[PDB]
Structures are given as structure tokens and as C-alpha cells.
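Work package 3, deliverable 3.1, input record:
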Amino acid sequence: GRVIRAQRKSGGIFQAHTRLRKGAAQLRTLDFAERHGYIRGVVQKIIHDPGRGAPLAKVAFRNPYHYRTDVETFVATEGMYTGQFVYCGKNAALTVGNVLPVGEMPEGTIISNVEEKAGDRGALGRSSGNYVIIVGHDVDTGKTRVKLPSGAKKVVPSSARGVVGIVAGGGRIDKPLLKAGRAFHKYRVKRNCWPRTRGVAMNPVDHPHGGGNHQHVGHSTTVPRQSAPGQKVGLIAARRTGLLRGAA
Amino acid sequence: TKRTKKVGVTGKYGVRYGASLRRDVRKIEVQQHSRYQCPFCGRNTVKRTAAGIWCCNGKGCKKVLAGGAWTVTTAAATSARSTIRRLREMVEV
Amino acid sequence: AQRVTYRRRLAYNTRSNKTRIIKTPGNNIRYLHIKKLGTIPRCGDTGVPLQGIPALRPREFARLSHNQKKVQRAYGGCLSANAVKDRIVRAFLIEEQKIVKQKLKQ
Amino acid sequence: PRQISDIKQFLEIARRKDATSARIKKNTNKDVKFKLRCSKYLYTLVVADAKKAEKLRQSLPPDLTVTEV
Amino acid sequence: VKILKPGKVALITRGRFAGKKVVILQAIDQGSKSHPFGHAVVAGVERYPLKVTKSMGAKRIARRSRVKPFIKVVNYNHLMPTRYALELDNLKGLITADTFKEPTQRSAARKTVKKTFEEKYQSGKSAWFFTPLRF
RNA sequence: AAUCCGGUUAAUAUUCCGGAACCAGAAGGUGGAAUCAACACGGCAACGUAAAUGAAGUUGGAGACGUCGGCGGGAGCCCUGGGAAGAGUUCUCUUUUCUUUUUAACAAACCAUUGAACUACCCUGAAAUCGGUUUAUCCGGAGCUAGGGUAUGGUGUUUGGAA
RNA sequence: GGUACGGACAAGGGGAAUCUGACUGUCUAAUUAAAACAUAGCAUUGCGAUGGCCAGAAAGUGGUGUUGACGCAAUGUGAUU
Ligand SMILES: [Mg+2]
Ligand SMILES: [Mg+2]
Ligand SMILES: [Mg+2]
Ligand SMILES: [Mg+2]
Ligand SMILES: [Mg+2]
Ligand SMILES: [Mg+2]
Ligand SMILES: [Mg+2]
Ligand SMILES: [Mg+2]
Ligand SMILES: [Zn+2]
């Protein structure tokens, strides 16, 4: 057989379309001011980022060591506005938009763009409408427990920073796309992943699902976790299948 | 005159896509094209510019607001703010 | 009636191939190749176009006299009049507040 | 090309060293154009009078080259 | 209760001297034929003196500690009043609505203001007045 | 960054010729301007001028941006009424029918007049009996209407070029 | 007045039903344009980054990723009801 489509997604025509993107959305390099105090920035712009649901905020900070201003690109939280002051650091207040160590915020606070490691500059809860919940602190050997959008519980060090509030851009997925063309335009600014041909619509040379005098898979579509590339298609390492009626 | 009993703004789609789909789009489209009130200026000159971005007109408060995809504020964001404010006001005192 | 041709080898209606029709003193209808239109500088705080300054391509500004490229006022040619007024009042009031907060700190 | 609206201004430009030559153009409408060729510009003065044209022609520097069209 | 009165220090907010600190000389609350609005006659600092330190020489300090003043009639709406006020020794009746009609009297009034402002700068009793506002 | 017209050859031309310009760089050749101690004045203001010292550093702007829809102006074209010059037709008719009746880059002054603005901004003033207003319903105590100003300025006007 | 006149030119035939694919879109260049493919919608699967999927002979190597579950990856079904 030939190299299946999933195996060809290794670069080339499958790279991300990034010309129209203004910059990665990052927290700010963890520095002396944030470790010990706070630093104030002003929201200069709130902008659309092609390929991203959530809007981005360009935030201007004074450089502590040089006569210069540093512009940061943040994931905008809902409620943020241009001209707003945001404060980042250990002593920042618990206000929507501020950036604080998760260990400095009480249990139950709603946060976004949370670091997995202290200083990684934001990993968790970044897509539109998403957030992370503080679940508890363990002061001895400081580790904070958080709930992720997937429902998983994670332990981050109580120095990983987070942004107070929910990512802006609301309930985007509530609107039916309604048309192939709208899906076309959504993925045109993302990557070459649409439209998708079904495996069973192919010939055996193309896909493990291909071939047959009717369109059918043949063997089970739940394939083992340790399948080789080229046979790892369908429902990979599925714990179960079918329409769930009540889950947790 | 009424010009439409049901489809409203979704009349542009005609008979395509299915009634339920057009009805769901109709509820969202009415939201995303509505005018909302600016809390900082008091005028109803708040309209959307691209999905989470709500702008204001006039010579005053040319600011831009980060909001929901289809409405200026979401219920989740509003509930989070009061939750955050309660938590802020209980460690403060 | 008289029909025209591009005077350059650029054969396509691009933004660098702008033209307009002239009638010559030989009674000839022909193209004149013209530049893109200029742009007035914009306020750094509000984005409004700044008054008192002509709309030119960027390098044409190198040929004007100094006073044609600015306004005789603080931040002239860089900030609008109303933006400067906001800055002056804001700076004064904030400085005064820093004075009272220092006085009441002791 | 530049137009000169004052006879005093035109005579001053003629007395300058760049002023090589002058031209006299007599239009059908009995108006007379005095054209001064400098290095960069050609300066025209429109004289609408024949009496004034004669006085201006006599008012020129004596060494100036005045050419008739 | 009247914010704008002679001796008060104000900030110009519009015009060529925007951001320059001025002292009110006359407060014409009612509008005249020339300037039909609540205007004031003011004297302000067009060029503030430069800071001087102990390492400077004597001649250099003299150069830096100079004031170039201006005199102007300003609409009240183009003034931001302050809380400071100046003493206004001999700038009492020297700048009326008549020195502006004559450039000779204008230069004479400015020279007089320059002398009092400069002497007032040395031995600083109003330091805030001669420090530029940064904005 | 910056070039136009007219002409010219068997055959090149925004390249040659005639005429008229423009840009960039270098040196500084004159003239002017400011400065007697220091780097100009005017205007309430928007902002104005023939010039109007400005190193490092910083910040801002221009370059610089989709698509559809109608509305308003300009230029060339098209059409039309006279005059002129030549031509076609003319048993009869046709004060007829046809052709020509042109004006560049660049420079200057004006400029919503004559066509397109209350477009943006400023000043006075303080609006319910609310008014203003687009084909399209937006605007106003965060200052409407009105009155007067300031700026943006040509493929507009009047000229130079240029008959 | 030729009972003629969108006078040439230009320029829809219409209706009642059944099978089938919802629709617009796409392909066997040179025998197949379709009921095939795609599609919105519906559902399932993996994965919280010391990760999932993909790559490379190797690497102090690459893609997804200017990304973070309202995401990326892997399948099925095929608008609505
Ligand atoms: Mg097949
Ligand atoms: Mg196979
Ligand atoms: Mg040839
Ligand atoms: Mg079909
Ligand atoms: Mg075929
Ligand atoms: Mg065929
Ligand atoms: Mg199918
Ligand atoms: Mg279905
Ligand atoms: Zn507002």
C-alpha cells in the first residue's frame, strides 16, 4: 500500500498558516518585579487573531532596567478593555485581567492562561470561553490543585501564574456553521485539514479502511494503542465506544 | 408590513440548511448584530467587530471591549466576576 | 474614438500602474502614469488625522519646510490638539494626587 | 515656468547674473509678454499696454540680451 | 470662591503655549468687544530654566538659569487653574488691554516680566512655577 | 526618489532634437532669517508664516493593505445649440449633411464659490413644544440647531508653460 | 393599416407522479458527471505537554504549534424532522 493521509501530516503543505498572526500569546517572562511585587501595564489594543477564536490584547509595560517600553501579547479575558490597567506579580490584586501566582489566589477563583511550570508563560485554559478553577493549595511543598476544561485535575506549583477571569470570545461553538464555505473560511486561516475524505471511501492501497464491494471497515475500528503508523486509524485505544447515556 | 412571520434575518438563507439550523442561527445572529449599552459612556453605541471584540463610536470612549462571541457579556463571565469579587472581598477583610 | 496604451512595460492593472487620461496640445488622448495618493499623519493617541499637514507619500515629506510638517504646539505633528490637552490635564491632576498621597502618608 | 506680476520684481531678476536672455512675444490681443530665461526657471511678465511695454523695454539693463520672437 | 483671580497660577491647555504654567495678571470675567468671552491676561514661561548643579561653573549657571517669558490673553476655557499662586510684586498694572495693541509696549512688558521672573527664579520661593510639567 | 509636450527616422524614442521641468547626492558660491548674551512672531482657539539652533536615547506616524452595495463630485469619452473653414448631395427637397475647431508635465494664487462638505476640528451659546438630518436613521448637556472661524486641495478655477 | 405590430434580431414549453442524493460545491485530461466524493449537522475515539498524532539514517532534529480541550489529532454517519 501507499503512505496514508495521517502519515503525510508531518510538515510541508500541512504547516500552520501564520502570515496573518501578529505574535504568540504569552504571559510575560517571570522577572524580579513579578516574583516579589507587581508591575502595571496598560491595554493598548484588543485585536482579532486569524485562526484563533479568542481576541488578543496588546499590553504595554515599562522596562524596569532600560528606558524603553515592552509590548506584551496576552489572551484577552472577558471584561478587558483598551486603556485598562493590568497588574502582574505576587502582590497584584484579585481583579479580572491581573496575573498572579496561583498560590496567591483563594480556592474557587476562575483563571485562564495558567502555567504548567512556573515561568512557562501560559499553557492551560487559553481557547475562547475556557478557564481553570483553583481547587486547593498544599502549603507544605507548595503545590496547587486545579480543574482543567477537560475535567481533569492537575497539580501545578504554587508559583505558576494565572490570569484572573475567563478567556474572551464567549460561546463561539454554539453557532451552526451551516455551510461548507464557512468551514472553508475557518480552516483557510488555520491549516490544510479540511475537507476530509472518509477512509472507507478509498481503495485498499490508500487506507486500512479502503476497498470492498460495499463501503465498510471490515475489522474493528478500535485499534490497539501500540499500532504502527499507517495502521493507527479509527478509534485509537478506545476504552469504550457507542452513544454514552450518562457519564462522569 | 411584517414581510416574514418567522425566519426574520434568516430569510436570507431561503429554504436551505433545515429549519432547526436556521432557527439556531437566527437566535445568535439577532444577538451578534444587536446594539448594546456602553457602561463607561452610557450610549447604546456598542457593536461587534469580529467575535469577542466590541467597539464604541463617538468622540468619547473610542475604547474596545473584549466580550463574548455573540453578546458583549456572557453569563459565565458575569458569574465569574461576582465569584471573584466575593473572594477578593473576603480575603481583604 | 481614440484608445490608449500603457506607457510602460507593466501590462497589468496593479496599484503601481495607476493612470489618468490627458488631452495633449497635439489633440492626442493618452495615459499619464500617476502615483498613489498621499496620507496625512495620524495622532499617536487617538488615530485621528492631524490637522495642518498635507497628504503626501512618505519620502515627499523630506522636501517640505519644517513648519509644514508640524503644528506649533507641544507634540505638534505627533499628537492631536485634544489629545495633548488630555495629556496636560491628566499629568497635572495625577501629579497633584501624588502630592496629597505623599502629604497624607506622614 | 513662473509668472512675475510686478515690473519691479522682473527688473530685479534681469539684473541678476543667471539672467541670460529675454524674449518679447507680441500676442494678437495687443498684449506683450516679457520672458526671462534663468538657469532653473523661465519668468514671464504680462504687460497689457503698448506704452508700458515700450517703457519696460527701455527700463531693462543695457547689457541684457533682449530677443524678439 | 473665584478660582481665577490675579496672582493665581494656571496651566494653559490649548494653543502654542499648551502645557506652560502662567500667572494670572487680570481676570476679565465679562467679555469685551475684543475677546467677547471670559478671558484673562497672563504671564507665563515660554522656556523654563535648565537645572543647575554644584559642579557647574559660574558662567554656565548664569546661562542655564534664564527665563524667556510670554504675555497672552487667554480664554478661561483654555486654562486649567492650580492651587499654587505667585506673589506678583511689580507686575500689577503694567499689562493692561492696551500694551497688546502695540508691539513696542509688548516687548517692553515682556522685558519687565523677564526681569521679575528671573530674579524670582533665583532664591526660589515658587519652585513649582519654574519646573516644566512633563506630559 | 524623480519627465512632460511638440518634432524627427527606411527602421529607436517618456531614451534622439527643440522647448520646458523634476529628483537625489556632494561641496559650500552668494542672498536672506534668528541670536547685544540664546536659538522668531501672530491667533481666545482650531492653527498660521519664506526662514524660526536641537546630540544621545525613546515614542509616534507614513510605507500598509478584504469584499459587496448604492450615493455625491471630477477628468476623458458620448450627445447637443450657434459661428467659422473646407467638403458631400442638389429633377425636387434639405438656413442641409460630414470633417476640423487642441492645450502636457511642471509653477503660482485661490477655492465647497463656479461643482463637490458643515468632512474633521475650534470659538460663541446652551437645546422638550426636542431638534438636526441621509437614497440608505444616525447625531446632540460627553454641548444639538444656529452664527463665525481653522485645516485638508485637484483630474476644479484664473494664470504662467502657450501659441 | 396587412386583424399587424418583442414584425429581423433577441428570447422559458408546461403539468401529474415514483426511485435517489438534502442543498451550492467535487472527480475518472482522452469512452463513466452519477445515486459516487465533499458538505453543514449528528456521534464516537486519543491526548493536560515528561503529552496525543505525524516525521527522520541520525542528531544539541522537524510538523501539529504564533497551538492548549470553545484545542489538536483519529474515525464513522451524512441538511432538517
Ligand atoms: Mg471508489
Ligand atoms: Mg492496506
Ligand atoms: Mg517601431
Ligand atoms: Mg447532489
Ligand atoms: Mg473521460
Ligand atoms: Mg462525459
Ligand atoms: Mg456520499
Ligand atoms: Mg440527519
Ligand atoms: Zn461608549
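Chain B touches chain A through 34 residues (CB under 8 Å).
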